[PDB]
Amino acid sequence: CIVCIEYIIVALMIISAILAVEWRDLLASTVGMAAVSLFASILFFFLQAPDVAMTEAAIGAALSAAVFIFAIKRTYRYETEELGWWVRW
Amino acid sequence: ALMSLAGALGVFLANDFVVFFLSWEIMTFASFMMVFKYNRHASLKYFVLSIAGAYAMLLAIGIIYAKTGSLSFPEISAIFRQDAMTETLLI
Amino acid sequence: ISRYLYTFIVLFIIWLFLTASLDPQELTIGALFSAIAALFTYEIFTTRGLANLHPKRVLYFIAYIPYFLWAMIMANLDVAYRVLHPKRPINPGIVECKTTLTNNVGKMALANSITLTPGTITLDVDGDKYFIHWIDVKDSSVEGASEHITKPFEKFLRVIF
Amino acid sequence: ISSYYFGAISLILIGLYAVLVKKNLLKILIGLSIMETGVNLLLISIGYVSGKSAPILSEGVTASNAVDPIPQALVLTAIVIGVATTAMALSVAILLYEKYGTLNIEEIRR
Amino acid sequence: SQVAALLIALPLISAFFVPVLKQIGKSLIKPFLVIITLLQTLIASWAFVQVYSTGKPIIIYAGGWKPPIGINLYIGHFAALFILVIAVVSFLMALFNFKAVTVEPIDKYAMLFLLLLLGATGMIATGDIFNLFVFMEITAISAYALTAYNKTGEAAEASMKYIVLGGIGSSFFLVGVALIYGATGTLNMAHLAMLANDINPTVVQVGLALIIFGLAVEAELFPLNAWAPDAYQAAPHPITVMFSAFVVKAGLYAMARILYLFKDVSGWSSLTKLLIAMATLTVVFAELSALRQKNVKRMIAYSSIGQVGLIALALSLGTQEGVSAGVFHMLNHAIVKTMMFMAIGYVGITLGGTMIENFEGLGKRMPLTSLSLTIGGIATVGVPLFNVFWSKLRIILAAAHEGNLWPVALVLFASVVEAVYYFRLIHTMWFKGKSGERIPEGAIAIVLLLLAMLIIVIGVYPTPFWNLVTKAGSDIVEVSKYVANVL
Amino acid sequence: VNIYLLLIGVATLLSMYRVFRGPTTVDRLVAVDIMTTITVGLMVLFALYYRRIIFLDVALVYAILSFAGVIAFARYLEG
Amino acid sequence: FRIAPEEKVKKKPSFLKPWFGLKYLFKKPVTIKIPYEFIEPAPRYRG
Amino acid sequence: MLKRVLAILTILVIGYWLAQGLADVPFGQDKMVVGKYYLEHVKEETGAVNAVTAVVVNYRGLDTLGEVTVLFIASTGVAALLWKKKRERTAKTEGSVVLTTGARLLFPFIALFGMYIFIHGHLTPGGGFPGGATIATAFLLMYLAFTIYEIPHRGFEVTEGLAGMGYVITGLIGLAIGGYFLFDWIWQTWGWGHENIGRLFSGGFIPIIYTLIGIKVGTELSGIVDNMLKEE
Amino acid sequence: SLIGELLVLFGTVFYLLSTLGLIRMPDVYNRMQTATKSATLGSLGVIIGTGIWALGEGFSVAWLTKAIVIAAFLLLTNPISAHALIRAAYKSGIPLWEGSVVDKYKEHLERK
């Protein structure tokens, strides 16, 4: 079709946006960020501007998502939300 | 103590207002900085009160420069004669 | 020193394939950039120097890339047949296969070709054998060959050097 | 409304929502990067003329038939603006766990 | 003449030549910064005496494409003055930071400083709204990297809230640019103001509100400020000057530029009636949060926000008798806040830290650097015949004809409060000492004092300098002589 | 030229089930990695749809930048 | 013997200083929702 | 539940405000008031038949300059935020050998192709930035599949500043006449110019500036991931 | 030509049955194997199909050249993706299905 795949891509970007912030696992949040860069690149290409599509491909796919998990390497991986005696204090 | 006397000759020889409040502020500062040598709590109380007086005068001159339009003190008595024949109980 | 122009030749022919309308008034620019990309890093393609220009060898590989692709299409249609609606359940495999290949790009090529056959996913190549995430286990737990799990790609990768 | 307008403003919406309510710091940076992504998506989706389309050919396609040559230059900087700002903020996200002991906004007390 | 286009290119080429000489040695790294900002004062003074020679600004073109299709650098009567004062302040910083910041890797600090100078001469020369955004993001990431450059936990977090707030504001600013372009289709402010009268009354409101919003976040008023009395408290001492002198003025000018570029549309009056209210809300909160303040660097950090809020008070009130006097505060408060963070910086580098307990006792112990803090703290309330007295009188008289007596009795209330936390500070450094340690510091005993004699000459002669801002108000007051001096 | 497009849209929202549900930490990763290749095969398909020779120039660039991402996501999991 | 103050303990009353007891309008409230978040008593609780 | 629901209310009124503010035009044609000049005068005024590479380096000529200023400032900012004089790898935890040899042979396959992107801003879309970012990707593949791979820093950021200087020296020797004036196709300064208008004799001035900016942004992100993969 | 119009149909039914095979798998490992199988050979089928779509149609032939470039590039890059996805998935727990034998990799870890 014409507009139906557009609605599919845009609702897929929204469901990968909402589920990019609902998770606690930060590696999963980098996964959601990479999928958002995916659907943004596809929407850039489908809106007929290939310059921004290939630039956002080379930036958001493995220089914004692969720099973020690159930062959670020597940091946390969970939310660490905690059972317990002296807890939630 | 000599800056204060030049404030004192300034307020008395003030026939405009932009020489008036300048000289008044210089006088307030010079008197404060004279009594700002010991017992700071006594000094700063005088400074806060007299700055509140100086700057409430700046508020009043802001209102009487707004409502009339002109700033000059000799002619501003003439236009008060002009409306001599609800915002002025604040002034 | 001859492997440098070997890397130049491979980068040049990839540049030739990448640009459909190759013009002689354009090709000097790609030849220049293939040259600077070669002299940047030509310490990478060291598969025993330049000596891969054998007319038997490249004809062997191009004659057996449809051999590869026929294995891929047949094995992938087989794993498409594996999706039966209540039935044909796949159990995993862990079964191993040993190699005798030097020229470590051959270990790459065996791992890639076995990853492109029915589901035989490589995991953790060591220096003696391979470890394969196989399909439904009926052949063997340890395999003393390769023809029971895969097709003999080991004989044609034996002559990649 | 068209899907591009709603989807670009909802990506900015979700990126804004991930700054207010979330508590882990790297989740806040995820919200910043998402919101910048939706911003440059809106920045492209302003000039689509619904029709004639070849921004870069000008050889096989006739001229005066390309789409929006102004925002494609506004977005070529404004994307890598986002990755440079994110690469800058990630260094602070590393230093805050190195010097302090945690990465939660209610526990970082100077 | 486009020969004076080196206000951006010369800091650029020198900031790209300083990582070229970072491996050639260690000696000529920090002395490479002083000679270039001296060359910056030279190329600024060229533009300064060429702008005030005639009545025409230099329309620095971006090539062989006349505006609006290209970028124009309208270096107006405003711009040459501010490029001059940022050149002389950065040259005062370069001869300061030579022996005051060597604790940390100054191997790469020089390019970060000079790129802030690039964002400086870019931000107060921009003509395109795109170039406005790009130079503001240069200054923003400069500040992200340079308020974090101490790596001490309390300074690491001091950047963090600013990087996430400047990220959200730049995001909103690009949305506002996309909406103003979405109605008009043009970008250059010359072709924008002649068009933005009948584009759409319901589209220009949200775009202008979000543009003023997203340009305000990198500056300070009420919500988006509290990173700034966290940035001055935790930064290298020379860049606390260059932030408190410069970066507040570029944001407040470019906000008050583009606000006076759309002065015909509906809903604009409510926008400036919000901007009045938020500026009054920031002269009270900032200059009253310094009252029970312990750290003396924070005690000046709160004071620098309260002085820029009253700049915002008269930069968006009317058209005249106070916009041309609002600039009279921006070129004046930069000098007196250069004096403040010099003295705090020299205390923090000589004695150690900025706590009052190690700030107490500087009458006999320290030389006339303490007199420089004295004559600086005198000039923020503006008591004697000084320059902030002249300027604050011009701003309070500016808030007469429109927005009166409530947006006066809060800014003028704060100077009563600011009268308190200075003479609780000058008293505990001159008349509480009990400690005669000579500790000679005669390397700034002349240079800060020739600066301290620069506020004593403008204090007695404002009319050789107040005639400048009459012809330098002509870049913000109107649109018609601005546009006709472009097209 | 037209029917394949709606089939690929059916394919990608049918792959959405693995990233929404799925209790493990890596089933989401196998969800995104397959989602890139089907959209690369989408991006080649639109070159037929808009008849443009330049629209393949983004497809191979996205065929790189999936692979770097999924190595980087699956390298901290091992080290 | 070792009397601590002379007037050091006695403090000054204050108008609007109780607003610093209003700080916990936004922190997490310290309670345990007993249906059903359990407590796990001590390893040697007397029972 | 108070904070999330109240944020959803305020963000719904924000989105409704923007959507009511998005009532300019339903994706119509009437947008270019100055934008038609960018399209109808791009084949003869610059030389690049590409639309976006002529508007952002020649027309909006001080905006890829602020862009490389932003990327260079990101490099020097991350390098100033992380500085310890030790700079060791993490534990390096090898893991696979079809990965190291996998990214070994694949490293010049991206090095050939990333250069192809930034040399071609004439008929191909893009510019210097996707090619430079995938050159950084190739650097990352060799950096995330080996046990050290420390490219020598003394001699690495020299060429980054040299490439930025190579941009600005085209502005400074461009100042031999006027503001920019391209120095390359309209006057026979060092070589010829304006041969035809295809992908032959490299159009006008736009390719060599993309080689230089692609070299700058190519060594940009590789340095960032380098000094961010360094422990004590 | 028309043979391309059937080959891309074969590749897109291969795509759809691939994606159906992703959700019709019990555990992680068979989910990973069948997804990296059937979504990367029908890929090359589609790409060479679009090339021979442009054999006589299209403009001349040059789409086939870029098609064979991206196909031959996509053919060798997804095996390394599947390996590095699988190999990291064995660490940090992540157990397998009820297989016949799984221990031969575990025992050759703990051989010491």
Numbering used by the authors:
A (entry chain d): 3 to 84, 88 to 94
B (entry chain x): 104 to 188, 201 to 206
C (entry chain a): 7 to 167
D (entry chain g): 2 to 111
E (entry chain h): 2 to 488
F (entry chain b): 4 to 82
G (entry chain N): 6 to 52
H (entry chain e): 4 to 235
Give verbatim lines from the article.
We determined the cryo-EM structure of MBS in a dimer complex form. The atomic model contained 26 protein subunits and 116 transmembrane helices (TMHs). The MBS monomer consists of a peripheral cytoplasmic arm (MbsJ, K, L, and N), anchored to the membrane by MbsM, and coordinates three [4Fe-4S] clusters that transfer electrons from ferredoxin to the substrate polysulfide. The MBS dimer complex is assembled via extensive contacts at two main places between the proximal membrane module of one MBS and the membrane-anchored peripheral module of the other. The second contact involves the tryptophan-rich C-terminal extension (W90, W91, and W94) of MbsD of one MBS projecting into a largely hydrophobic cleft in the peripheral domain of the other. In MBS, a large hydrophobic chamber, similar in size to those in MBH and complex I, is formed by cytoplasmic MbsL, MbsJ, and their membrane anchor MbsM. The proximal (p-)[4Fe-4S] cluster in MBS and complex I is at the top of the hydrophobic chamber but, in stark contrast to that in complex I (and MBH), the MBS p-[4Fe-4S] is coordinated by only three rather than the expected four cysteines (C28, C93 and C123 of MbsJ). In MBS, this structural motif is three residues shorter than it is in MBH, leaving one of the cysteines (MbsJ C25) no longer able to participate in cluster coordination. The unique Fe atom of its p-[4Fe-4S]2+ cluster binds polysulfide (Sn2−), accepts an electron from the medial (m-)[4Fe-4S]1+ cluster and catalyzes the two-electron reduction of an internal disulfide, generating two smaller polysulfides (Sn-x2- and Sx2-) and the superoxidized form of p-[4Fe-4S]3+.
Here we present the cryo-EM structure of an early ancestor in the evolution of complex I, the elemental sulfur (S0)-reducing reductase MBS. MBH and MBS are found in the anaerobic hyperthermophilic archaeon Pyrococcus furiosus, which oxidizes the redox protein ferredoxin, produces H2S or H2, and conserves energy by pumping Na+. MBS reductively cleaves linear polysulfide chains (Sn2−, where n ≥ 4), produced abiotically from the reaction of H2S and S0 (Eq. 1) in the hydrothermal vent environments that P. furiosus inhabits, into two shorter polysulfides (Eq. 2). MBS contains two proton pumps compared to one in MBH and likely conserves twice the energy.
